[PDB]
């Protein structure tokens, strides 16, 4: 059950502050080693994920270029990466097959453009 990753979740910016998120980040929960894996053309991140009251978190160890996430995109990425760590809960509305990233009572990111 717990070992199926390398599954490209194209991250989606929902909230207005994340509209600057880069070209395209690939999110993949590594359920095989149980770690967060977030990588793209220019970023390489591992993390360990923990749960608190349904909030999915992840302490990251990302290595990443500057310029490829421009400046505000990198900010977007810090924003996104801080979200998980603050406790992002996967869930939303009108979805049954796609993952959505929400924290502070609203979705600001998604895995795949399901909705």
């Amino acid at each position: 059950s717990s070992s199926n990753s390398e599954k490209e979740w194209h991250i989606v910016p929902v909230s207005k502050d994340y509209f600057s998120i880069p070209n395209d980040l690939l999110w993949s929960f590594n359920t095989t080693n149980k770690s967060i894996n977030v990588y793209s053309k220019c970023i390489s991140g591992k993390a360990v994920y923990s749960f608190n009251a349904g909030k999915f978190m992840g302490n990251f160890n990302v290595k990443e270029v500057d310029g490829c996430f421009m400046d505000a995109q990198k900010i977007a990425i810090d924003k996104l990466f801080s979200m998980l760590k603050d406790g992002v809960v996967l869930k939303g509305n009108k979805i049954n097959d796609t993952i959505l990233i929400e924290k502070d009572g609203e979705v600001k990111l998604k895995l795949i453009r399901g909705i």
Partner: peptide, 18 residues
């Protein structure tokens, strides 16, 4: 379990390993 869920590792991977 839910619209998306994944509030538990098991329920998370049960949803990922689909």
């Amino acid at each position: 379990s839910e619209t998306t869920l994944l509030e538990d590792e098991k329920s998370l991977v049960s949803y990922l390993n689909y």
